[PDB]
Write a protein that binds this DNA or RNA. Structure first.
Length: 82
DNA sequence: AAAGTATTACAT
DNA sequence: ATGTAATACTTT
């Protein structure tokens, strides 16, 4: 069992907010990420979109509005030792 | 239509 | 994967 998405500083930071919530919808994601980190609504989206494109996260259009669901669970950033 | 929340593309 | 941008759908 290894890490699928390549984690970084900005990569992990957003995951934390998604994991804080059960899953997350763009308003909760942006609303949180914008207050915590610099990143504007534009800036925020790459960490979501590219991750999804490469398999880190997965989006789903749920009944009301959409939910971004963590496509990773076992890994959830494998911080290797020096 | 406005405001808010969702969705994907382009450039780096 | 990261930063930045554009556009659509949903609810009000």
């Amino acid at each position: 069992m290894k890490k699928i998405p390549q984690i970084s500083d900005a990569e992990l930071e957003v995951m934390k907010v998604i994991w804080k919530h059960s899953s997350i919808n763009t308003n909760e994601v942006i609303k949180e990420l914008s207050k915590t980190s610099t990143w504007s609504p534009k800036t925020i989206q790459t960490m979501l979109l590219r991750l999804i494109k490469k398999g880190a996260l997965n989006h789903h259009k749920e009944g009301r509005v959409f939910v971004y669901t963590p496509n990773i669970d076992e890994s959830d950033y494998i911080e290797v030792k020096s």
